[PDB]
């Protein structure tokens, strides 16, 4: 009924860095060819959304942020073949065009159509579907889920199980899949190995889930906020350490705890120094370290390449290394088959209009994932 | 006839940094328990030996350097089981104790008994078997092959085929195995892939051999000395580029040539800048870059961790990833079955007494490998 028409709805607009989100009346254009308009049902608050506010992550402003979500297709543009009105969908902040060199590669998932590398904050066609008082509002990662309605390119949406609980599976759109895949797909954590996980937020907890599912014997959680430790243990951490408790550097502590270095480490915070620390604390000859955290824009780390020459492997990934359109439906199906739990990540549930409270909670350290509902 | 006696012989002693080797009389003690004294037959000049002269690689002085060699066992200490007098042998600069957590790991080769990480310049028991001018002289990487006779620990020597040509197979002691393994074992180069090799000396040429053996479709050799290009092509390079011929940085050129980045890159020089460049030129989502070159002591590089977050893999290795004592005899066996060639790496042969000339040849850019014969 609203198909082919402009929709007037509420969205959370970020006009300036370091300000609250502003709930505004926006207009959402109808989808053009190969585009999909989605009615949002739930969206998670991910630290990466906060990075937009803080200036950690640079993207064109003003902007509708939000990238971890699930909704129902309101309508489709001409030529769309992979979803239909009424379908449950998860937007993909990393697209899967299926045609680029990366999409064709067996392991690669960072599709060249992504709006992450050099953000334009638009649809694939270089334009915006959002206006606020006649002013164009930028998109974010081709998703923009902090809105009652959004429009995405077809390559940035996956159809999921019609019976799926959107208020939970929205986490598969970023936090869970990133964390879990970083362990299971990128690191390829082995049975009986020792792992160290730096950062015990939503993503780091999902890394622990992945390490536990892979059969790691030891999973050492590292966080400067000790209130994070109880949930870390609940999901599989065998021990937790707070660097603030020690008079010495935590890589030393972890090297002694692990009798010469860990098998697998993960940086799930977004700091240069913890990226170097995580690399150092893996075993010098065969250890692997995976960067998951997003560091501050344009900042370089300093490291000694002898750390690598001895035989360490250092790698990073987006979205847990999952080819997004292929994997998101299977991860939902796996959730339905009770292969993993999502409830441990959800600490708060708030209506969408309370977005700023949701971010206050994240920033204060009290929440893991707040789910915003419509 | 010399068994159990102190041997008086010639060795090239390095007394101070940035000075010629001094060929003089040294005294070589008989082997103690689990030690093996070797009459040297041939030794190659590796860039790493020159790094000791230049102070790029720090090890205690005064020293008998040299680590890429082959010889014949003169005598054994009590309890030695793996070699006998008269056996042909290759000293192992990376030991294989067989007992440490690294030796027991399926992937690791950087045995914890190595003398590379925290150089002492001794035998395993922390003493030296060399005396010169009444002074004790340090060992180098438990090998010290720039001497008519040396003493090595049993874990640092492998028995090889009795009919092998030592004036060739000495290269399996470092340069060949390092380069070859970096390609075939560490990087795990795939059939049909594109490779970029930075540095076309003995080790880089060996990397090319490995890339060709792995069935790479394209192998791009990169060197600032165009005189290296012909040999590179002979051993499998499909193209060669000199950074100095281009206005854009070579990472950009290489990215263009490969339609978005190479599958595998190798730094085989030993510069911080080329380490970062080699990382950058591999495809951002699934590229792998291997550091082989030895950088100047205690210097850190600076890099943007976004190069890894997109999905790149960065690693390095000692000795091409090979478990040294297992691998060296198999590599010799393969050489005698003509599975690879060593002749292309050998540009000069000189008697040992002309060691300084051999180093001049390396420093001038004229040679790949000079073999010294005793
Ligand atoms: N690579 C990807 O695809 C991807 C996907 C999602 C999120 N991320 C990034 O992953 C990171 C984690 O996101 P999240 O949503 O879990 O965040 P979060 O803020 O919930 O978790 C970060 C945790 O790190 C801890 N921490 C902060 N400083 C620390 C320090 N010095 N030492 C130890 N712990 C410290 C905090 O106490 C917190 O628990 C962020 O940088 C985010 O942008 C990356
Ligand atoms: N990891 C290991 O186990 C291991 C083993 C052997 C050697 N190495 C190291 O590997 C490196 C190569 O050894 P080698 O014996 O082949 O040395 P080499 O000196 O013969 O070759 C190095 C090559 O790099 C080229 N080069 C110099 N600057 C360059 C620049 N900016 N760009 C491109 N090319 C440049 C030189 O012209 C030369 O051809 C050295 O650092 C050595 O110490 C490491
Ligand atoms: O949280 C996903 C994400 C969003 C923006 C930028 C990133 F690098 C990233 F990983
Ligand atoms: O050339 C072998 C070698 C010798 C000394 C130090 C090194 F890192 C190394 F790789
Ligand atoms: Zn996210
Ligand atoms: Zn693609
Ligand atoms: Zn060498
Ligand atoms: Zn060992």
From Swiss-Prot, chains A, B:
Main localization, broad class: cytoplasm
Modification type N-acetylserine: residues: 1
Any one Gene Ontology molecular-function term assigned to this protein's record: zinc ion binding
Required co-factors: Zn(2+)
A cellular component annotation (GO) from this entry: cytosol
Catalytic activity: a primary alcohol + NAD(+) = an aldehyde + NADH + H(+); a secondary alcohol + NAD(+) = a ketone + NADH + H(+)
Localization per Swiss-Prot or TrEMBL: Cytoplasm
SMART domains for this protein: PKS_ER
Annotated keywords: Acetylation, Cytoplasm, Metal-binding, NAD, Oxidoreductase, Zinc
Binding, Zn(2+) 1: 46, 48, 67, 174
A GO BP entry: retinol metabolic process
Binding locations of an alcohol: 48, 67
SUPFAM superfamilies, per database record: GroES-like, NAD(P)-binding Rossmann-fold domains
Entries under Gene3D superfamilies matching the protein: Medium-chain alcohol dehydrogenases, catalytic domain (3.90.180.10), NAD(P)-binding Rossmann-like Domain (3.40.50.720)
Cofactor binding note from Swiss-Prot or TrEMBL: Binds 2 Zn(2+) ions per subunit.
Entries under CDD domains matching the protein: alcohol_DH_class_I_II_IV
Chain sites annotated for binding Zn(2+) 2: 97, 100, 103, 111
Coiled-coil region: none
Documented EC number(s): 1.1.1.1
Enzyme category, top tier: oxidoreductase
Amino-acid positions noted as binding NAD(+) in the UniProt annotation, renumbered to this chain: 48, 199-204, 223, 228, 292-294, 319, 369
Subunit structure: Dimer of identical or non-identical chains of two types (E and S) coded by 2 separate genes at different loci.
Similarity comment: family membership: Belongs to the zinc-containing alcohol dehydrogenase family. Class-I subfamily.
Protein name: Alcohol dehydrogenase E chain
Source species: Equus caballus (Horse)
Species lineage: Eukaryota, Metazoa, Chordata, Craniata, Vertebrata
